[PDB]
Amino acid sequence: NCFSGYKDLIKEGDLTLIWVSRDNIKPVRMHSEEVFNTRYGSFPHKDIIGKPYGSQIAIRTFAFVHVLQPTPELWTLSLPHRTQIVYTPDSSYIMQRLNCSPHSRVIEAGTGSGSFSHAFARSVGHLFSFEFHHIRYEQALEEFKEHGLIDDNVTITHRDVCQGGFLIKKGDTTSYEFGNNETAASLNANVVFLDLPAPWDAIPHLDSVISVDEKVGLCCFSPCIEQVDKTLDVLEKYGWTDVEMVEIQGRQYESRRQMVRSLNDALERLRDIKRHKIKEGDSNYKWKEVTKMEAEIKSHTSYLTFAFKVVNRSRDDEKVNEIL
Amino acid sequence: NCFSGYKDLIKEGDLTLIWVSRDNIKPVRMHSEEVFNTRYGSFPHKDIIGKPYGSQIAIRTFAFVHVLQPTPELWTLSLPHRTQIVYTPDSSYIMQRLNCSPHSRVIEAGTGSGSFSHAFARSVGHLFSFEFHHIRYEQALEEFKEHGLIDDNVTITHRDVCQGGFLIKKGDTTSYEFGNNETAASLNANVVFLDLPAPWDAIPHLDSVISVDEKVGLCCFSPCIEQVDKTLDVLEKYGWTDVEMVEIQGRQYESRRQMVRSLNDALERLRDIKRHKIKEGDSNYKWKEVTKMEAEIKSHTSYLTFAFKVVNRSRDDEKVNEIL
Amino acid sequence: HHHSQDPMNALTTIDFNQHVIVRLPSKNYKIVELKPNTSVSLGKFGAFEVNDIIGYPFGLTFEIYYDPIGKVRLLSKYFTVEYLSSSNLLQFLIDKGDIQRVLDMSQESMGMLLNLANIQSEGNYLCMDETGGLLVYFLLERMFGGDNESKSKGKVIVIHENEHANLDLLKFANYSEKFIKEHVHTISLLDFFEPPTLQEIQSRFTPLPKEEARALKGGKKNSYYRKLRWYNTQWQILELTGEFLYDGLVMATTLHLPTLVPKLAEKIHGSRPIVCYGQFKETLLELAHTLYSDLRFLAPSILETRCRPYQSIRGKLHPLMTMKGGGGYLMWCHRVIPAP
Amino acid sequence: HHHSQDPMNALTTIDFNQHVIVRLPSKNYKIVELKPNTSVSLGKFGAFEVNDIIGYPFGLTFEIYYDPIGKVRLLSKYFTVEYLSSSNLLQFLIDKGDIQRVLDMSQESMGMLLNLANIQSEGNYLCMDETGGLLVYFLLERMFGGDNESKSKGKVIVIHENEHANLDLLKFANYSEKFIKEHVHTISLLDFFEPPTLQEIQSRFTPLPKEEARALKGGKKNSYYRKLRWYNTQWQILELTGEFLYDGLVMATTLHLPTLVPKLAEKIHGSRPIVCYGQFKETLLELAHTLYSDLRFLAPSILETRCRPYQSIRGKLHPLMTMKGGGGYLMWCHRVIPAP
Ligand SMILES: C[S@@+](CC[C@H](N)C(=O)[O-])C[C@H]1O[C@@H](n2cnc3c(N)ncnc32)[C@H](O)[C@@H]1O
Ligand SMILES: C[S@@+](CC[C@H](N)C(=O)[O-])C[C@H]1O[C@@H](n2cnc3c(N)ncnc32)[C@H](O)[C@@H]1O
């Protein structure tokens, strides 16, 4: 993955994220004969290649961009704004509550634009991702491939998980590379994230693919509270416990300044009226530091329903005896 | 109402609110031979009576209280903490969205502890309040009476509004004083607030008591979202429009200070360790002003469902012609 | 009036020469003055005849249809007509993009300000309002409900930064000029803190005995009463600035609060609320620490209220996905009198 | 080991000599060390034999019953045994009242910090942690998942205020002392900013040729290697403080950030994230304005994340009525390299 590890110098062929402004971050593949364009100027790649990652790049009549190494957080900010993706406040909370680590073996459906996928892949032992829509599947496959996710720890599979479950067998449409004598993947998932219209149709299929000897964590991502209600019903029927729904609310603040305007100065203007019978931070004036909420807030992304399961609720009795 | 108007001096017999601390406000009736007790000392009423409202009262070995004129906001803060009452963030929003004023004629059920009642009564043309529980009814009646609400603009009636509706007839258990030739109150409500377990059972009875020639506003107060769902159903059936549910979230912040601790001072301590081979705001130190959220927040009080109705959806056609 | 029949109630009913609210299908607001025998254009959504909506209650939705000015009927494109409440005026100003002009205030913050300040029909309130009068309008509507014939005697006293107050939003309010001059008094910061003395005023004018003044006519009568109105303006300032104590202080100003609020509070009675609205919490934090040192203020608190609406469709309930941030903050405290 | 059979996986399975989490019926947490042939008291809820829970998966609820130490069976009073995750350690510290010790941090704020900082198994991260090591523990668990045998080579470098680091919470972590010394390096602010020079170090000690040092025995060998460990400590400081550039900076300190973060960021590579946690937003606001002036920092942002749980019972869904306030704030930005 070009998302993984820490690169020093920008090289020809590298995928970069070019920061133009806070709301304008563009994925750009470096090529010596290409030019990057902004509403403020043109930035030739040959004047970028060879410089350190994190470089500010300047052109005269001055205009600037910053060239950054891809990261899931930054990649997520670069995706089309109104779309159906998981943002960092939700996903970072989900990964932390489900305790993600190289120990994690995760099942994600559906893949969508792969926002959560990239954050999973950075941290996790393996990611098994499922996508119902064949065009979306092919786009995600091509992109995961290009990014180096496929040759690292990510598998994607074209599947309707509500109808066909989560098994990956030789012959299925999948990126999975089967080992010697392997005719089916052994998913052995201990982490499950469902982002689907009807997660309650997918939950029954999980018993065939989750780990049987450890606590398995699940999060379902649903926009409407009647969807949460259907999920709570089916989680209970299929033996999932410690069930809790939460919401996550993220806010961002600008650092700003408000002009200090004294009473005495207002009085002095009134006295002078009687006799006759600015850019923020301007050093001619006094300023007070203040925080200002972002103009538009994401007041709802989805409800997050967490649940846990242990299949083999037992121990090896005399293996414990055989320790003495 | 001793809640209404603005008193100058504390008089014998006055109901006061004695502020002991932010979470300790006590209703105390002034009587020259009585004494008010606090975990910090005893405050004789005779040393309070005759002083201006808002007076800080001091006793030696010094301890203090402040004696305030009753107000709905303060009264609400003085009620038992865990109880089922409406707090100022919800009620002030409800009154503003329903545009409360002396023009308002309101219907409230149930009365409960009368938190919202007092805020209504301050602003509104008349308040018609209904309480199902006979002991609660008698307590609210006695208290409203004592406070002067009953002899001003408040009526309370012992009623199950879901079963018996909202009509007030001579013979009913009510505080209503019937005028000459009056055998029934004409409620003519243009504002309705329902705080009940099943507001959808009360909504059908409203058509008999609401104003018929103006926009009528309704707010239903329900803790669970399945309750909101039942309300949305019945509001639609009975012709209520512009229906919207919202939540109100209130937070309070303390003004605090955090000690400023420089790098250089930490280095200098490390240098001295090498050679050998406070109360907040303390003037010996530097401090930064900060805001600190209250330790416990009210993260949910109830869902607020608003709705509006016009009964006579018509005009006087040639009365409009008769203007030319 | 000159009609024998009872007039229409402009608080309940769409009426001639009133400023009213019109909600478009895109849900943004317009303010429309209902001049008789005129038409109103809603651009894309058509135009209609003012006369055709008079006499209806507020809250109705009208369809414009054509057999360019259309006809109207109750909706069986369209618009909804509403009373111009304090809430709807605020929303209209936000729709038209004036959010910084109103200092980022929200319906819920202003609603809470009214109750924290204990605003009542008979109170005399000290007020600073930098919004063009939106705060004064919230007060008046709560106090009087739009009723020009109200018998209540409450007043809003507005202290302001320039020579004249900016209360232009009151031009939308449907209060008469008489009502406003009886319930709203304006006075500059300078006149409020350094008022003229009686001697200073009388040495420029002392009235004629009223028998003599009554007998004046022509240009001498007009010349004199113009001087007498100046005299009464000055007299009112004396009344407002003496040992008169007010029933509450409400503020929406961007002046420096720590150096202003303590001076204003000298004229507030013991036990009365003080409420300062601020767009930025840090502003109020500085104020609260200042007031903490001053025993004339009881327990200053910074409060926040935020409304989150839901998509209120049965079978698809969830909060709105996106909405506007902001809404500001309130500093609440009470004026009190320290013990010796 | 000395058993022929495969050992138990302490990441999936309740195991001897592990520190684990116990959730009581009152839902508060305890941390319990599972020493073989010992008993554990839960006060009111009874006591049990450690041996009787070994070998089970985490996540199960056990009933204590009596025919005072009881017997245990799966719940058909009781307790639930959980892995000691970074989340559960934080919750345990909050339950026991140590909320100010952990600077009011929440699960969601720490979860976001991990991802904003792009924390990975192979990264070398600069860290300040005033919590007794809770932040270091969040990092290690994300990087290595509790796996003492992990092949990953990532490191947390902890810069600290006193002579020694306070990382006592790591005593609960079930990482071996070897693992910790290979992945956690500690260095004081003074050693980090004013490190010793090579000349200074060698003039107090230069090693013997390793053939000669190997041939040492007795007290001379012990005397020498003690000096050689001091030498290696100093050498490690040279490695950590030279022209070594780090992959990220994460901070949870109450030191003055505006005067500290720019100095620390000199050792961070271009394009790497900087995340400062703060209990108070005003602190971070001051920092953000400071960093705005410094072209080595790209677009500093103050972020907030808040979790609100629901009562998750079908037919009675609503958010929790009351809960703890706070949870703190993050300042996020990226180190960048200005153009000439
Ligand atoms: C909102 S998106 C997922 C976004 C993704 N979590 C992210 O962070 O970028 C939902 C995706 O689920 C896919 N999907 C829907 N139903 C599915 C099913 N039954 N099986 C697999 N995928 C499905 C849809 O095609 C869509 O791409
Ligand atoms: C939560 S309380 C109201 C609190 C009140 N809003 C306040 O702010 O203090 C609910 C009250 O409704 C009353 N109530 C319940 N069902 C009722 C009914 N059918 N008719 C009238 N009152 C009812 C209950 O006795 C209870 O006192």
**Cα separation of A53 and A66, whole Å?**
9
Q: Check if the beta carbon of residue B184 is closer than 8 Å to that of residue B167.
A: yes
Phi/psi of residue C262, nearest 5 degrees:
-60, -35
**Cα separation of A115 and C280, whole Å?**
34
Q: Check if the beta carbon of residue B77 is closer than 8 Å to that of residue B89.
A: no
CB contact under 8 A, D280 and B290: yes
**Cα separation of A272 and A270, whole Å?**
5
Choose among C334, C302, C86: nearest CA to B250: C302
How close, in Å, is residue B320 to chain C by CA atoms?
Answer: 7
List C49's β-bridge partners, or say none: C39
DSSP C248-276: -EEEE--S-GGGTHHHHGGGB-TT-EEEE
The amino acid occupying position D222 is N
- Alpha carbon distances (Å) from D38 to A10, C173, D65, D70: 59, 80, 18, 13
Q: Check if the beta carbon of residue C117 is closer than 8 Å to that of residue C127.
A: no
SS3 assignment, position D61: strand
Touching subunits of A (3+ CB pairs, under 8 Å) are C, D
Helix (H) or strand (E) holding C5: none
**Cα separation of B138 and D300, whole Å?**
60
**Can you list the positions of beta strands (E) in chain A?**
15-21, 24-29, 35-38, 41-44, 55-59, 63-68, 105-109, 126-131, 154-158, 191-194, 216-222, 241-259, 287-293, 296-297, 303-309
Choose among C91, C89, C50, C98: nearest CA to C72: C50
Task: Tell me the angle at which helices A88-97 and D107-116 cross, rounded to the nearest 10 degrees.
Answer: 110
**Cα separation of C42 and C24, whole Å?**
8
**Cα separation of D61 and A313, whole Å?**
10
CB contact under 8 A, C285 and D285: no
Phi/psi of residue D156, nearest 5 degrees:
-110, 120
Nearest ligand to the CA of A127 is: 1
- Alpha carbon distances (Å) from B320 to A23, B315, C52, C54, D323: 55, 8, 9, 7, 58
Half-sphere exposure of A296 (CA within 13 A, CB side): 6
List D71's β-bridge partners, or say none: D65
Six token digits for residue B246: 């919202």
CB contact under 8 A, D321 and B298: yes
How close, in Å, is residue D186 to chain C by CA atoms?
Answer: 37
Q: Does B184 touch chain D (CB under 8 A)?
A: no
Query: Token pair 């704030």 is at which residue?
Result: D329
Nearest CA to ligand 1 atom 13: A110
Pairing mode of beta strands C61-65, C78-82: antiparallel
How close, in Å, is residue B57 to chain D by CA atoms?
Answer: 33
Choose among D319, B64, D202: nearest CA to A303: D319
DSSP D62-76: EEEE---B-EEEE--
Task: Tell me the angle at which helices D107-116 and D134-144 cross, rounded to the nearest 10 degrees.
Answer: 60
Whether the upstream peptide bond of residue B110 has omega within 30° of 0, thus cis, is yes
Give span(s): CATH 3.40.50.150, chain D. Answer: 89-195+242-335
* Cα angle for residues B30, B32, B38 (degrees, 5° grid): 60
- Contact residues, chain C, for A301 at CB < 8 Å: 321
The arrangement of strands across the sheet holding A55-59 comes to A24-29, A15-21, A63-68, A55-59
Number of H helices, E strands in chain B: 8, 15
Q: Which of A260, A274, A299 sits opposite C190 (nearest CB)?
A: A274
Q: What is the CA radius of gyration of chain C?
A: 24
Half-sphere exposure of B146 (CA within 13 A, CB side): 14
Q: Which of B260, B291, B298 sits opposite D322 (nearest CB)?
A: B298
Q: Check if the beta carbon of residue C105 is closer than 8 Å to that of residue C42.
A: no
- Contact residues, chain D, for C285 at CB < 8 Å: 282
Task: Identify the closest residue of chain D to A311 by CA–CA distance.
Answer: D57
Choose among C48, C59, C74, C47: nearest CA to C14: C59
Give the DSSP letter of residue A259.
E
Give span(s): CATH 3.40.50.150, chain A. Answer: 72-269+285-324
Choose among A106, D326, D270: nearest CA to B293: D326
Q: Which of residues 133-192 of D touch A (CB under 8 A)?
A: 141-147, 150, 152
**Can you list the positions of beta strands (E) in chain B?**
15-21, 24-29, 35-38, 41-44, 55-59, 63-68, 105-109, 126-131, 154-158, 191-194, 216-222, 241-259, 287-293, 296-297, 303-309
Question: Where chain B is broken, by preceding residue (C–N > 2.5 Å)?
Answer: 61, 277
**Cα separation of C333 and C335, whole Å?**
7
Q: Which of residues 208-247 of B touch C (CB under 8 A)?
A: 211, 213-215, 225, 228-229, 232-233, 236, 241-247
**Cα separation of D336 and A55, whole Å?**
6
Phi/psi of residue D98, nearest 5 degrees:
-85, 30
Phi/psi of residue B117, nearest 5 degrees:
-55, -45
CB contact under 8 A, B93 and C336: no
Q: Does A22 touch chain D (CB under 8 A)?
A: yes
Phi/psi of residue C92, nearest 5 degrees:
-55, -45
**Cα separation of B126 and A317, whole Å?**
75
Give the DSSP letter of residue B146.
H
What spacing in Å lies between the alpha carbon of A202 and ligand 1's midpoint?
A: 12
**Cα separation of C338 and B272, whole Å?**
49
* Cα angle for residues A298, A299, A305 (degrees, 5° grid): 100
**Cα separation of A183 and A179, whole Å?**
8
- Alpha carbon distances (Å) from D307 to A119, B302, C121, C321: 20, 18, 42, 16
Q: Check if the beta carbon of residue D86 is closer than 8 Å to that of residue D170.
A: no
The amino acid occupying position B125 is G
CB contact under 8 A, D54 and A64: no
Is A195's C-beta closer than 6 angstroms to any atom of ligand 1? yes
**Cα separation of B45 and B33, whole Å?**
7
Per the annotation, does A136 bind a ligand?
A: yes
List D310's β-bridge partners, or say none: D319
Q: Does C300 touch chain B (CB under 8 A)?
A: yes
SS3 assignment, position B98: coil
Nearest ligand to the CA of A158 is: 1
Q: Check if the beta carbon of residue B306 is closer than 8 Å to that of residue C307.
A: no
**Cα separation of D187 and D167, whole Å?**
12
Choose among B296, B297, B293, B298: nearest CA to B256: B293
Q: What stretches of B79-190 show up as alpha helix (H) in DSSP?
A: 88-97, 115-123, 134-147, 161-164
List B156's β-bridge partners, or say none: B129
Q: Does C27 touch chain B (CB under 8 A)?
A: no
- Contact residues, chain D, for C282 at CB < 8 Å: 282, 285
Q: What is the sign, positive or negative, of the torsion defined by CA atoms of A119, A122, A127, A133? A: positive
Six token digits for residue C14: 């769409």
D205 Cβ contact partners less than 8 Å away, ≥ 6 residues apart: D227, D228, D230, D231
Per the annotation, does A115 bind a ligand?
A: yes
Q: What stretches of chain D show up as alpha helix (H) in DSSP?
A: 86-95, 107-116, 134-144, 177-183, 189-193, 198-202, 210-215, 218-241, 261-264, 281-292
How close, in Å, is residue C206 to chain B by CA atoms?
Answer: 34
Instruction: Count the Cβ atoms, other than its own, within 10 Å of residue C314.
Output: 14
Q: Check if the beta carbon of residue C64 is closer than 8 Å to that of residue C70.
A: yes
**Cα separation of D130 and C72, whole Å?**
70
DSSP B297-316: E---S-EEEEEEE-S-----
C125 Cβ contact partners less than 8 Å away, ≥ 6 residues apart: C117, C119, C139, C154, C155, C156, C157, C246, C247, C248, C249, C250
Six token digits for residue C68: 């360019």
**Cα separation of D122 and D143, whole Å?**
8
**Cα separation of D286 and D75, whole Å?**
53
Residue D214: which region, alpha, beta or left (left: phi > 0; alpha: psi -120 to 50)?
alpha
**Cα separation of C139 and C146, whole Å?**
11
The CATH classification of domain A1-71, taken from the options 3.10.330.20, 3.40.50.720, 3.40.50.1240, 2.40.50.100: 3.10.330.20
The atom number, within ligand 1, closest to the CA of A193 reads 6
- Alpha carbon distances (Å) from C37 to B118, B321, C10, C16: 46, 12, 18, 10
Nearest CA to ligand 1 atom 1: A84
Instruction: Count the Cβ atoms, other than its own, within 10 Å of residue B134.
Output: 10
- Alpha carbon distances (Å) from C270 to B63, B265, C28, C157, C250: 20, 47, 44, 18, 15
- Alpha carbon distances (Å) from D248 to B207, B283, D157: 66, 37, 10
**Cα separation of C214 and C226, whole Å?**
14
- Alpha carbon distances (Å) from C119 to B6, B101, C113, C115: 11, 11, 9, 6
- Contact residues, chain A, for D247 at CB < 8 Å: 6
Instruction: Count the Cβ atoms, other than its own, within 10 Å of residue C300.
Output: 23
Instruction: Count the Cβ atoms, other than its own, within 10 Å of residue B184.
Output: 13
Q: Check if the beta carbon of residue B150 is closer than 8 Å to that of residue B175.
A: yes
Per the annotation, does A114 bind a ligand?
A: yes
Pairing mode of beta strands B35-38, D297-311: unpaired
Choose among C76, C80, C75: nearest CA to C58: C80
- Alpha carbon distances (Å) from A117 to A13, A153, A158: 23, 11, 15
Half-sphere exposure of B198 (CA within 13 A, CB side): 8
CB contact under 8 A, C305 and B250: yes
Give span(s): CATH 3.10.330.20, chain A. Answer: 1-71
**Cα separation of C52 and A201, whole Å?**
55
SS3 assignment, position C94: helix
Q: Check if the beta carbon of residue B252 is closer than 8 Å to that of residue C302.
A: yes
* Cα angle for residues C201, C207, C209 (degrees, 5° grid): 155
End-to-end CA distance of chain B: 47
- Contact residues, chain B, for D161 at CB < 8 Å: 266, 269-270
Residue count of chain D, please give it.
340
**Cα separation of A136 and A125, whole Å?**
24
Pocket of ligand 2 (CB under 6 A): B 84-86, 109-110, 112-116, 130-133, 136, 159-162, 195-197
Topology (CATH) of D89-195+242-335:
Rossmann fold (3.40.50)
**Cα separation of B146 and B27, whole Å?**
13
Q: Check if the beta carbon of residue C314 is closer than 8 Å to that of residue C322.
A: no
Give span(s): CATH 3.40.50.150, chain C. Answer: 86-195+242-335
SS3 assignment, position D178: helix
CB contact under 8 A, C322 and A297: yes
Instruction: Count the Cβ atoms, other than its own, within 10 Å of residue B271.
Output: 11
**Cα separation of A89 and D110, whole Å?**
11
List A304's β-bridge partners, or say none: A221, A246
The CATH classification of domain B72-269+285-324, taken from the options 3.30.70.1880, 3.30.1330.10, 1.10.3720.10, 3.40.50.150: 3.40.50.150
What spacing in Å lies between the alpha carbon of B297 and ligand 2's midpoint?
A: 24
**Cα separation of A77 and A88, whole Å?**
9
Q: Check if the beta carbon of residue A71 is closer than 8 Å to that of residue A77.
A: no
The amino acid occupying position B276 is H
Q: Does A77 touch chain D (CB under 8 A)?
A: no
Q: Check if the beta carbon of residue D91 is closer than 8 Å to that of residue D75.
A: no
B78 Cβ contact partners less than 8 Å away, ≥ 6 residues apart: B17, B25, B26, B27
Choose among A75, A76, A74, A96: nearest CA to A86: A76
Give the DSSP letter of residue A54.
T
Q: Check if the beta carbon of residue A281 is closer than 8 Å to that of residue A252.
A: no
**Cα separation of B65 and B67, whole Å?**
7
Topology (CATH) of C86-195+242-335:
Rossmann fold (3.40.50)
Q: Which of residues 184-223 of D touch A (CB under 8 A)?
A: none
